[PDB]
Each structure stands twice: as C-alpha cells, then as structure tokens.
Amino acid sequence: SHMDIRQMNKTHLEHWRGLRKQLWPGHPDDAHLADGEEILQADHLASFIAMADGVAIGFADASIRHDYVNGCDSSPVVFLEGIFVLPSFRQRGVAKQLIAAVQRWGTNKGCREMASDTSPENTISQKVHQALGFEETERVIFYRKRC
Amino acid sequence: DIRQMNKTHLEHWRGLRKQLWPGHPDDAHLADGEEILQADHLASFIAMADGVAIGFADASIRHDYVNGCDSSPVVFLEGIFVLPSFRQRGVAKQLIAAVQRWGTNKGCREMASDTSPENTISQKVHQALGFEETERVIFYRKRC
Numbered sequence A: 001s002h003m004d005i006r007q008m009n010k011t012h013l014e015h016w017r018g019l020r021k022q023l024w025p026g027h028p029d030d031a032h033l034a035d036g037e038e039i040l041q042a043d044h045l046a047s048f049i050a051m052a053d054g055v056a057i058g059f060a061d062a063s064i065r066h067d068y069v070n071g072c073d074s075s076p077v078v079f080l081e082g083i084f085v086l087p088s089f090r091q092r093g094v095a096k097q098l099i100a101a102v103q104r105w106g107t108n109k110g111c112r113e114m115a116s117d118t119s120p121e122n123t124i125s126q127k128v129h130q131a132l133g134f135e136e137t138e139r140v141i142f143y144r145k146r147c
Numbered sequence B: 001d002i003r004q005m006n007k008t009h010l011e012h013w014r015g016l017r018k019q020l021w022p023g024h025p026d027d028a029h030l031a032d033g034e035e036i037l038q039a040d041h042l043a044s045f046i047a048m049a050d051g052v053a054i055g056f057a058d059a060s061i062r063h064d065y066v067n068g069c070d071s072s073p074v075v076f077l078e079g080i081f082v083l084p085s086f087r088q089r090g091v092a093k094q095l096i097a098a099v100q101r102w103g104t105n106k107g108c109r110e111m112a113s114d115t116s117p118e119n120t121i122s123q124k125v126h127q128a129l130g131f132e133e134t135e136r137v138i139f140y141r142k143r144c
Ligand SMILES: CC(C)(COP(=O)(O)OP(=O)(O)OC[C@H]1O[C@@H](n2cnc3c(N)ncnc32)[C@H](O)[C@@H]1OP(=O)(O)O)[C@@H](O)C(=O)NCCC(=O)/N=C\CSCCC(=O)NC[C@H]1O[C@H](O[C@H]2[C@H](O)[C@@H](O)[C@H](N)C[C@@H]2N)[C@H](N)[C@@H](O)[C@@H]1O
Pocket: A023, A024, A080, A081, A082, A083, A084, A085, A086, A089, A090, A091, A092, A093, A094, A095, A096, A097, A117, A118, A119, A122, A124, A125, A127, A128, A129, A131, A132, B065, B067, B068, B135, B137
C-alpha cells in the first residue's frame, strides 16, 4: 500500500507519541507531551511520521544542530535524533524513506552534512546506517559531571 | 596562571592546538580562533608559565542534545591539551575548573566531555576529576 512521510503537526501528535513510547519505553509520560509541543513550535526540530492505510507505522525525530557534531566538518548539521519502525513493518524501506525526509528537511535548511549515532551493541542500526549511505566517522565515550 | 583566551594568546594557543589535533588544516585554527572570540557561547582558557602557554582548554555552551546529559544548556569540554613536560601537576584540573566556573556563570547544570576508547590516559583523567561515564556511541555522517 502507498506510504507517506508526513512532517509532524498538531494532527499527528497522538500518532507520534504512540510510537515514541515504544522506541523509548519508560521515558516519562510528561516528557513526551512537552517534547511534542516544543517540536511543533521549533525551527531547529522536526519529526516525521510514516503513514500507510491511515495508520502510523514508524517515525523519526530530527534536529538542526549548531553544537559541534562528532565527525562533522561543517555547521549547522541535520541530526537523526531518533528512529523507530514497528516490528511488523520492518525491512520494507520505511526507515529509508523516513531518513530521506530528514535529509530533505536538513538540505532545505542549508545543512551540508547529516549525522547520527548509535550504540556499538546495536548491530542492526549500524547495518541500517551504512546501507543508507552513512559512513562511520568516530567512536567515543561520553562523560558528565554535575555543576 | 589560567587566563581566558583573547587576541594576544591566539598564536601560542594555535601552537598547542596543532599538537592536540595535527589532522586539522592550519587554515582552520585561524578561523576557529576568530570564531571563539566573536561568540558568546564559546570560550577558551590558557595555562601560562613565565608568559608561555603550556596548556589550553577549548569549551562551549551546548544548546542541542548532548549524549548522557538531561538538562540544557551544558558546558562542554571541546578540547584540552597540556605540554608533556608540564603534565601531572594539576594544570588540566585547573583548566577544567575554569571551564566549569564559566559554564556555571552561563547557567549550565551539567558539564560534559568525550574521548577516544583508545585514549586510556584521558579516561583516567575524567575519572580522577569527578566525571562519570555515561554512554559509548558510534557516530555516522552522510554528506547532503
Ligand atoms: C533500525 C530500524 C529503524 C530500521 O527500520 P526499517 O524500516 O526496517 O529499515 P529499512 O528502511 O527497511 O532498511 C534500510 C536498509 O537497512 C537494511 N536493513 C534493515 N534491517 C536490517 C537488518 N535487520 N539486518 C541487516 N540489514 C538491515 C535494509 O536492507 C536496507 O538496505 P537498502 O537501503 O534498501 O540498500 C528498525 O529496525 C527499528 O525500528 N529498530 C528498533 C529501534 C532501533 O534500533 N531504532 C533505530 C536504530 S538507532 C537506536 C534507537 C535510536 O534511534 N536512538 C537514538 C538515540 O537515543 C538516545 O538519544 C536521544 C534521547 O534519548 C532523547 O531523549 C533526545 N530527545 C534525542 C537523543 N538523540 C541515545 N542517547 C543515543 O545514543 C541514541 O543514538
């Protein structure tokens, strides 16, 4: 059936929250709500919903980042902040089309580079990133200290 | 003494920074210095001994997602290098303390950093200075 990638607006908020809670289970209930509203008002945040037959089968969150991005040489950068496709709809090209939409958005915003990161443990994600034309740039360990 | 970088430090800062990052074109350090001095959300700090720079830290105020962190903005240690001769004397500790104060003055509740999995010494350093490991990731890039 015909699939559409829709940039998320007020009308897709429930579709998006329903999927996001499956990518990140236990990511607090009030966070998803505030995140939704922020994204709709942003010019440096956009999310994209894969729709077919009137149901939402996957999503991607994207940003335009001005912070230094690991492995990139230019600024700003279009960044893949999250991506998830429902188990039953996987390996059908949903993520490919989601990422194409993120790229289109970032390109129209004047980004020269698209970036993403994933866990060294998530081998499917690594294969996916590489199939869709991403190259590995560097691996890093992050640290934090409370101020 | 640790001072915030200004126009007069640029040349000696560039000399140390090329040692941290030999890959960087020499074009870039020039540009990067101008950018830091122009930007409110960037600052660098220089450790001096007898008026010669022997260490530096580059820092930013980060407004985008930062791996391992839960608030925004974040003070981020973008780069730190101390001359081998001046190592293990607390120079890095003092540079990072200056970075942390700048970030607190910019309302950051978290300081973050990253390093190579092979850079074992830098890992001990973050550990020693009170940082905690958050996550390890692989970064990807696609040219648009
Ligand atoms: C990976 C998916 C999305 C692929 O979907 P698909 O539709 O099945 O793919 P396709 O389009 O059909 O396939 C594309 C290509 O890949 C190939 N492929 C697909 N599947 C496989 C396969 N199983 N094996 C081999 N090859 C495969 C396929 O052949 C295709 O080849 P080609 O282009 O046609 O030539 C899918 O399998 C899936 O949903 N899997 C489960 C979830 C998952 O792993 N998702 C994405 C992979 S990244 C992991 C989750 C994620 O997005 N995390 C984001 C970040 O989360 C966290 O950070 C967040 C933070 O938590 C938030 O609060 C902030 N707001 C933002 C911040 N970024 C962490 N701190 C970061 O470190 C994380 O990076």
